[PDB]
Amino acid sequence: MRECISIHVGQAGVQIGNACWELYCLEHGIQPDGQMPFNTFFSETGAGKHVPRAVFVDLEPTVIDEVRTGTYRQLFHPEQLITGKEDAANNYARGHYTIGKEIIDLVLDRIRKLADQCTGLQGFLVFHSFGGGTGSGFTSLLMERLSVDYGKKSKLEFSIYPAPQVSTAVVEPYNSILTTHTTLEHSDCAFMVDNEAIYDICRRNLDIERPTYTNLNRLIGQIVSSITASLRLTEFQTNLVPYPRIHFPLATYAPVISAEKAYHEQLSVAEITNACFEPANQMVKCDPRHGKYMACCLLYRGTIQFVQPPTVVPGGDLAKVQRAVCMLSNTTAIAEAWARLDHKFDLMYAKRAFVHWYVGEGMEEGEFSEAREDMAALEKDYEEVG
Amino acid sequence: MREIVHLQAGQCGNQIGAKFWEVISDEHGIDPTGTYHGDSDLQLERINVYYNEATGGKYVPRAVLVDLEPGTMDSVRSGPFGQIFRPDNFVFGQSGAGNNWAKGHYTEGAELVDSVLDVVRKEAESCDCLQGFQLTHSLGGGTGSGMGTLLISKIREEYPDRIMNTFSVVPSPKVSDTVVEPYNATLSVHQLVENTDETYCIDNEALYDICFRTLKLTTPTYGDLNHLVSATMSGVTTCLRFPGQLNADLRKLAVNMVPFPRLHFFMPGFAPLTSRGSQQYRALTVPELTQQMFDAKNMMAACDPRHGRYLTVAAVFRGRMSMKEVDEQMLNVQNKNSSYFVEWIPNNVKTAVCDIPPRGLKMSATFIGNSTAIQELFKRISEQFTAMFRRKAFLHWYTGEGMDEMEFTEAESNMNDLVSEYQQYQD
Amino acid sequence: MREIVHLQAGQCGNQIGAKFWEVISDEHGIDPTGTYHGDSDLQLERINVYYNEATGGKYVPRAVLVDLEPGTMDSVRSGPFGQIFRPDNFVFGQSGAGNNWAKGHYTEGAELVDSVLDVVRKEAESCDCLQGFQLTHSLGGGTGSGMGTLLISKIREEYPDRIMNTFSVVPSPKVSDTVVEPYNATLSVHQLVENTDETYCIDNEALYDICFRTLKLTTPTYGDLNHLVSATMSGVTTCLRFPGQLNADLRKLAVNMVPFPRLHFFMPGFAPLTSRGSQQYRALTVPELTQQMFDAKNMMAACDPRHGRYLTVAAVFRGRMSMKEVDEQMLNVQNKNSSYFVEWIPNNVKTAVCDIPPRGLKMSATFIGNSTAIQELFKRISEQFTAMFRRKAFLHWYTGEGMDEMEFTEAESNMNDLVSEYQQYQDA
Amino acid sequence: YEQMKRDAEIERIMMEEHDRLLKEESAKQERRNKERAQYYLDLEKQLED
Amino acid sequence: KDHQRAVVAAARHHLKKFNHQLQVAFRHYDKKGDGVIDRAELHEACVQANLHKMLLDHLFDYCDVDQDGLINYLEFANFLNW
């Protein structure tokens, strides 16, 4: 009766959600037509069918239609899968102001039915990213609507944070500063991951070259399942955050090793606890030695300056390790990542690059300055709590 | 559900356009009958973007072919893949424009401009929620460019909140065919700098040097050049048709590219190009593909990057391929080479990866460059416009039916101000 | 079992009224000898409506043929009508019509009508639930209007509660194969504005341009020209002959579609109208059928609809369609281009569907619409009179019987009174 | 092993299409040769005239 | 074509009129002669009645049953009426 409801928004959201629900139906005995040959995330029909508590939303049909046609089509109720007509064009302008008003009503109504079929509410799991248009603006609209609506029940978000050096979109600092500006207060807590740090840890811990997105989202699904494996969630919210702005913990997983080295090396509790604090094995590419740790949570499935076993995925790379630890840490290392991201925003906003699309769609020239000053306020708040 | 409506203009478009619809169609498994014969189930999923459905389970393209001599429509319809269209959509005049701006813009195209927007209307009205259009042409001739610059600007005044993609085969000066090509290209950028939301600049001189050194072909006809052009529109809207591990839409790719509005001219380029005598020896991976898509000879514009500094870069990739090898390989080209990139853009490179390659290839990509030295393609047209127009070499055949001496010099500095707008951002 | 009395008139409407019957005969299966031939029993259910039965398996029509010349009914006898109907009611003389209105109304119109009205009155008195009148005429010629208004005028004087279903090919602005067509209109406005109930106003011009652009045919003769008129008068009456998911009678289509005492001049259209090639290349299900019939391209007039509004639009449908789909798609066209319609009716259009289509087609419709765009046709015939008035240009057949220089111009005022009382409500 | 087998099949397919290219090139060359023979023939005919 | 069709219709009509003016005897005679819908037998019946033969053969083929060419015997007498 300890339920949680999952919404997966944007393309990064639905590809990490597919790997997630793969891992959960793997973890229970649920073969993926829904019938056992558990009800914290599932609802059980009287016929013997298991339906997830999940809503998928995107504005290109070509990323939901893969889920609707592929091998998980007999898992869902087929109007849980929200689908637009034109994508948000990597615009906060289009996800927030112009296109998202055709689907926000259906999103809220399916949230309303999935949150009336339950018996005790604990939180929602919103899976998103800080690059794209519907990963920023529609998530901010959904965020403000659900914090105004449901009140104090906890919303956890999982964000692919834009990397220190390498990114696909040119426009990314604009969307990231603008989404954090209005997704500070509404969300209860969100977690940071970086593609570049996951690429380096995928290069050197598990000895694979040329990784890809399924090899990343397997790791992200293992981390999320390790967070919410103590139910088969308000404690994190009253533990980690000192003040109501610093709600971005970092995460890692300690025994991420292949089978060929896992056969020789044992995994003691001491080995996995120190492997969490090694900066080579962090999963957000910041420098933690310039930071000082303000909090740690260490979930054990199965100079360091303070201020049920894991499952196995078919076609997987992480070896079967008897015990593992997921670290949900909170550091003072993100003061350099925010400085570099807001500097990347500042270079483009010195001469108004790419601004006139969002200007002609919805916002004024000072509506970016408001986000700029409200992120300078965030780095004076880390410097203040230094 | 995020659709598009194709259109044509002139002879140079119709050889590209009718080559385009035998590149999309056989990549969708569709016979020239229209009967679907395809292995995969993904193909019938997104037919609704470019096509429409006839009774019987047949598929019709969403396109209109327009020109001012009926010899160029009979050539298309008699072709191998020309029957698929609507015979009611074939629209053409009878009195030829004959490289006349004043005909194709002012008098002759104005008794076809009633008929062509109705075919634009009733075919872009069955669509549920539009994304934009397409127009394929050149900027040398009269009705391929003067009607082509009216068909944009009228359509801009009815559906102005969509994305009207266009093409442009630019007049090469050193590969020239018409004596008066400055008088038609300089009057064409005037009504096209303000009415398209993106527009490519390919030209026939660089399409020869991509075809004499990399391809090393002996005899290039006009069926192997427009094959190169129709296979780099399929790259830039594959995400609009097919899923992938990271997809960028049409309208996503507009926002990230243009720094300030008047800078929306691009430079296309197709990444794997090999001669048929040297294909087996060449290994196909991503580091051995990024060195061919940044090459100065695999660029389908006559301009050069190294006489300028880059602004933004897109690169849609296609195939089964890991994403670390995209993310850091294009860091590295950005990282070592630092002079050629601007410094108030801290990350100069986009990406997008589909899952479905072009037919018969293990791996492919498509470059989109936005250089700053493309002003050298605009300095080389204006200096061929300060010579003929100073002694008034040819004006009395265009100004005999509608314009004035002031109409050209109103639209000459409106093409010459764009050189200086690149110059202020050049350093 | 409901009925409408027919008559046939003019040289124009006789051939289209000869073209009337062959479209109806394939719907049910009356072979021209008289044997019923159709496996659908719903044809057999309403053989009363245009027809009479005969003993011996045969069947016969209900229409009486009049023209003041022999050969037109000898041309109708070259068609199947003499093969079906009684050889008594062919009422033909060899005398000269002369294409004078005053010799279609006064000399052989006067003599030869009582050998017709004694059978016009006969078929009415033989049955009980008579409801209507048909008369297939033209506004064009003198003798197609001089007898045409004669068979209307004196008959509402003793049958005053009827569905009068005329036809009138109007004087075209450009196509003119007769130099006396500007005169024969204003004579036919003295009576037929008051004494009609529905009128199929067509012209010769607009039946070519449908055949030029849309049909992509290169020869409209007078032979196949009539299917643009003959097939679309059969759309209205399939409520009577045949069942449906809704039903609208031609007393109901008098109620629903005529809003005013005198505004009942109509303009039809048939829905799967296309060329040979484009029909594979265009889908026409209900989502595309409505976008065709409301073009400026399937009209039976040359007037400009964007120089007007639409007062009362109806459409009778024919086939197995979802009524959600018709109600939604009519709502879109009613709202998208909503500035076409007038501000009087809140729901400016009207629909009615059935369950029987024509032959060889999955689906059709039959759009008949009372626009207000036809108002600038009226200025033309005032202009085509006023040039032929200061000259008295042809008045030596009409002055032979006698209509003076005032008796024309007090009916010319009447044409303006068909505009003036229309103009009083044209704006505020 | 499955990925290796797929690699071998796809490589054999591409070498088949290259062999097709070789055969069509030889056909085009023989077509050019027969055009040259035809030109020689009717030039000799004109000399006889 | 439609005109010749109406001509054949009127011909069969006058044939039925003569049938009224016996029916069984005529049917038996036709069956014993050439063929129930034989074009040659058709032309004989023509001569007789008095319906003065390419068009006559065409009408016979029209009446002749598809493939059967006997107008379905019983239906052949039926058309002789019609």
Can you give chain D as a three-state secondary structure string? CHHHHHHHHHHHHHHHHHHHHHHHHHHHHHHHHHHHHHHHHHHHHHHHC
Mutation target vs B (from D14, D23, D29; most B CBs, 10 A cutoff): D14
Contact list in B for residue D21 (CB cut-off 8 A) is 276
Say if the Cβ atoms of E12 and C33 lie within 8 Å.
yes
Of B58, B122, B126, the CB nearest to C280: B58
Say if the Cβ atoms of B126 and C288 lie within 8 Å.
yes
Give, in order, the Cα–Cα distances in Å from C298 to each of C8, C199, C356: 26, 18, 22
CA dihedral A151, A152, A156, A157 (to 10 degrees): 40
E8 → chain C, closest CA residue: C33
CATH number of C3-257: 3.40.50.1440
CA dihedral A43, A45, A49, A55 (to 10 degrees): -40
CA distance A175 to A181: 10
CA distance B357 to B234: 10
Task: Examine chains E and D and say if they touch (3+ CB pairs below 8 A).
Answer: no
Cβ–Cβ < 8 Å for B250, B131: yes
Length of chain C: 428
CA distance B107 to B105: 7
Say if the Cβ atoms of E9 and C35 lie within 8 Å.
no
Q: What is the resolution of this structure in A?
A: 7.7
Domain-wise residue ranges, chain B: 3-257, 265-374, 375-425
- Secondary structure letter of residue A350 according to DSSP: T
CB atoms within 10 A of CB A289: 11
Give, in order, the Cα–Cα distances in Å from C116 to each of B319, B332, C147, C151, C234: 84, 100, 12, 10, 25
CA distance B104 to A224: 63
CB atoms within 10 A of CB C54: 13
CA distance C59 to C55: 8
By the 10 Å C-beta count (0-12 exposed, 13-18 middle, 19+ buried), A145 is classed as middle
Contact list in E for residue C83 (CB cut-off 8 A) is 6, 9-10
- Going by C-alpha positions, the residue among C189, C233, C208 that lies closest to residue C377 is C189
For residue B406, the SS3 value is helix
- Is residue B316 within 8 angstroms of chain A, CB to CB? no
Between helix A61-69 and helix A10-27 the angle, nearest 10°, is: 20
Side chain identity at residue D26, one-letter code: S
- The pair of structure tokens assigned to E73 is 């015997």
CATH 3.30.1330.20, applies to C265-374 = yes
Residue that the structure tokens 């840890």 belong to: A201
Please give the distance of CA A95 from its chain centroid, rounded to a whole number.
18
Determine if residue E68 is labeled as part of a ligand binding site. Answer: yes
The DSSP line for C5-55 is E--B-TTHHHHHHHHHHHHHHHHHT--SSS----S-HHHHTTTTTTEEE-S
- Secondary structure letter of residue A257 according to DSSP: -
- The pair of structure tokens assigned to B233 is 């529109």
Q: How far is E10 from chain C (nearest CA, A)?
A: 7
The DSSP line for C130-196 is EEEEEEEEESSSSHHHHTTTHHHHTTTTT--S-EEEEEEEPPPSS--S-TTTTTHHHHTTTTTTTS-
Output the CA angle B268-B272-B273, nearest 5 degrees: 90
Say if the Cβ atoms of C281 and B125 lie within 8 Å.
no
A99 → chain B, closest CA residue: B129
CA distance C254 to C244: 19
Task: Examine chains E and A and say if they touch (3+ CB pairs below 8 A).
Answer: no
What value does the CA radius of gyration of chain C take, rounded to a whole number of Å? Answer: 21
Mutation target vs C (from E2, E19, E23, E78; most C CBs, 10 A cutoff): E2
Of B53, B87, B88, the CB nearest to C283: B53
CA distance A133 to A146: 19
CA distance D38 to A214: 63
Architecture of domain B375-425: Orthogonal Bundle (1.10)
Cβ–Cβ < 8 Å for E76, E65: yes
For residue B397, the SS3 value is helix
Say if the Cβ atoms of D21 and B276 lie within 8 Å.
yes
Cβ–Cβ < 8 Å for E41, E34: yes
- The pairs formed by B23-26 with CB atoms below 8 angstroms and a separation of 24 or more are B23/B227, B23/B230, B23/B231, B23/B234, B24/B50, B24/B234, B25/B61, B25/B81, B25/B84, B26/B359
Determine if residue C280 is labeled as part of a ligand binding site. Answer: no
Say if the Cβ atoms of E3 and C78 lie within 8 Å.
yes
Between helix E2-20 and helix E54-63 the angle, nearest 10°, is: 70
- The pair of structure tokens assigned to C166 is 């005329």
Determine if residue B142 is labeled as part of a ligand binding site. Answer: yes
Say if the Cβ atoms of A212 and B351 lie within 8 Å.
no
- Secondary structure letter of residue B300 according to DSSP: S
Q: How far is C223 from chain B (nearest CA, A)?
A: 25
Contact list in B for residue C278 (CB cut-off 8 A) is 86-88
Q: How far apart are the first and last CA of chain B?
A: 42
Domain-wise residue ranges, chain A: 2-249, 250-333, 334-386
Say if the Cβ atoms of B88 and C281 lie within 8 Å.
yes
- The pair of structure tokens assigned to A84 is 């637009």
By the 10 Å C-beta count (0-12 exposed, 13-18 middle, 19+ buried), B344 is classed as middle
D6 → chain B, closest CA residue: B362
Say if the Cβ atoms of B345 and A347 lie within 8 Å.
yes
Output the CA angle C110-C112-C116, nearest 5 degrees: 115
CA distance A243 to B55: 64
**Could you tell me how many CB contacts below 8 A there are between chain A and chain B?**
149
Give, in order, the Cα–Cα distances in Å from A138 to each of A5, A11, A14: 18, 12, 14
Q: How far is B110 from chain C (nearest CA, A)?
A: 19
Say if the Cβ atoms of A168 and B45 lie within 8 Å.
no
Mark whether A235 is an active-site residue. Answer: yes
- The pair of structure tokens assigned to B398 is 């265009």
CA distance A193 to A195: 7
CA distance C120 to C65: 10
- Is residue B393 within 8 angstroms of chain A, CB to CB? no
CA distance D7 to C77: 81
Residue that the structure tokens 């369609």 belong to: C321
Q: How far is A147 from chain B (nearest CA, A)?
A: 29
- The pairs formed by D10-19 with CB atoms below 8 angstroms and a separation of 24 or more are D10/B362, D14/B360, D15/B280, D17/B360, D18/B276, D18/B279, D18/B280
Contact list in C for residue E9 (CB cut-off 8 A) is 31-33, 83
Question: What are the beta bridge partners of residue A151?
Answer: none
Say if the Cβ atoms of A62 and B46 lie within 8 Å.
yes
CA distance C307 to D11: 68
Contact list in C for residue B125 (CB cut-off 8 A) is 291
Cα-flanking dihedrals φ and ψ of residue A105, to 5°?
-70, -45
Cα-flanking dihedrals φ and ψ of residue B269, to 5°?
175, 135
For residue A382, the SS3 value is helix
Give, in order, the Cα–Cα distances in Å from C348 to each of A7, A162, C235, C341, E4: 45, 56, 21, 6, 50
How many helices (H) and strands (E) chain B has is answered by 14, 15
Cβ–Cβ < 8 Å for B229, B16: yes
- Is residue B58 within 8 angstroms of chain C, CB to CB? yes
Say if the Cβ atoms of B126 and C280 lie within 8 Å.
no
Contact list in E for residue C35 (CB cut-off 8 A) is 82
For residue B75, the SS3 value is helix
Output the CA angle B190-B196-B197, nearest 5 degrees: 135
CB atoms within 10 A of CB C289: 23
Q: How far is A354 from chain B (nearest CA, A)?
A: 5
Say if the Cβ atoms of A353 and B260 lie within 8 Å.
yes
Name residues whose C-beta falls within 8 Å of residue A146's C-beta, 6 or more positions apart in sequence: A111, A124, A155, A186
Determine if residue B104 is labeled as part of a ligand binding site. Answer: no
- Is residue B333 within 8 angstroms of chain A, CB to CB? no
CA distance A204 to D24: 50
Determine if residue E34 is labeled as part of a ligand binding site. Answer: yes
Of D10, D15, D18, the CB nearest to B362: D10
- Is residue E13 within 8 angstroms of chain C, CB to CB? yes
Give, in order, the Cα–Cα distances in Å from C194 to each of C154, C164, C261, C286, C360: 12, 11, 9, 38, 40
Q: Do domains C3-257 and C265-374 have the same CATH topology?
A: no
- Is residue C280 within 8 angstroms of chain B, CB to CB? yes
Q: How far is C422 from chain E (nearest CA, A)?
A: 47
Determine if residue B226 is labeled as part of a ligand binding site. Answer: yes
Cβ–Cβ < 8 Å for A301, A324: yes
Cα-flanking dihedrals φ and ψ of residue C198, to 5°?
-150, 150
- The pair of structure tokens assigned to C317 is 């449908």
Say if the Cβ atoms of C33 and E9 lie within 8 Å.
yes
- Which helix (DSSP H) or strand (DSSP E) does residue B270 occupy? strand B265-270
Residue that the structure tokens 């967070």 belong to: A227
Method: cryo-EM
The DSSP line for C70-106 is SHHHHHHTTTTHHHHS-TTSEEE--S--TT-GGGTSS
For residue C59, the SS3 value is strand
Output the CA angle A84-A88-A90, nearest 5 degrees: 150
Q: Which of A27, A86, A157, A235 is catalytic?
A: A235
- Any chains having at least 3 CB pairs less than 8 A from chain E are C
Q: How far is B225 from chain D (nearest CA, A)?
A: 19
CB-based burial, E46-57: b 16+ in 10 Å, e otherwise: beebebeeeebe
The DSSP line for B18-45 is HHHTTTTTTTTTB-TT--B--S-SSTGG
Give, in order, the Cα–Cα distances in Å from C411 to each of A147, B188, C150, C185, C426: 78, 60, 17, 10, 22
Considering only the top CATH level, what class is A2-249? alpha beta
Determine if residue E64 is labeled as part of a ligand binding site. Answer: yes
CA distance B335 to B332: 5
For residue C332, the SS3 value is helix
* Four-residue CA torsion sign, C56, C62, C68, C73: negative
C213 → chain B, closest CA residue: B88
Cα-flanking dihedrals φ and ψ of residue C317, to 5°?
-115, 170
Residue that the structure tokens 């229309």 belong to: C422
Considering only the top CATH level, what class is A334-386? mainly alpha
CATH 3.30.1330.20, applies to A250-333 = yes
- Going by C-alpha positions, the residue among B211, B380, B234 that lies closest to residue B299 is B211
Of A62, A167, A354, the CB nearest to B243: A62
Determine if residue B204 is labeled as part of a ligand binding site. Answer: yes
- Going by C-alpha positions, the residue among A279, A258, A169, A278 that lies closest to residue A215 is A258
- Going by C-alpha positions, the residue among E64, E52, E53, E62 that lies closest to residue E9 is E62
- The pair of structure tokens assigned to A296 is 């740690």
Say if the Cβ atoms of A87 and B251 lie within 8 Å.
yes
- Going by C-alpha positions, the residue among C207, C211, C214, C203 that lies closest to residue C292 is C214
Q: How far is E8 from chain C (nearest CA, A)?
A: 10
β-pairing verdict for B202-203 and B312-319: unpaired
Cβ–Cβ < 8 Å for C68, C93: yes
For residue E38, the SS3 value is coil
Cβ–Cβ < 8 Å for A104, A110: no
